[PDB]
Amino acid sequence: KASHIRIANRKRVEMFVAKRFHLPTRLATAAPDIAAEWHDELNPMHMYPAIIGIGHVQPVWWKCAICSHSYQMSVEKRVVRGGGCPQCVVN
């Protein structure tokens, strides 16, 4: 008998681990600024910043706010390690 909560009405997880880890560490929550760049065109529909959360090692598409370039990077590299746009760092 464990009680669950659906994050963003899609992902059902245990309430304990959800309140402790999942909820506070969602990409649209922890880093909304980074969530802004989320490439909504080239990036599968079943993945969006309201779910993937920081710490996602798989690379995802990012649309840059400055040079409007689309680059592929991991969410953990983008948020934790401080990843950036290759064209912007070149400029």
Give the interface with another protein as residue ranges (CB under 8 A). 8-12, 44-48, 50-51
Q: How far is the CB of 72 from another protein (least distance, A)?
A: 18
Q: Residue 23 or 51: which CB sits closer to another protein?
A: 51
Q: Which does 51 bind (CB under 5 to 8 A by kind): Zn ion, another protein, none?
A: another protein
Residues contacting residue 69 through CB under 8 Å, at least 6 positions apart: 63, 85, 86, 87, 88
Please spell the DSSP secondary structure of 54-65, one letter per residue: TT--SEEEEE-S
Q: Do residues 27 and 75 lie in contact, with contact meaning Cβ atoms separated by under 8 Å?
A: yes
Q: Residue 13 or 64: which CB sits closer to another protein?
A: 13
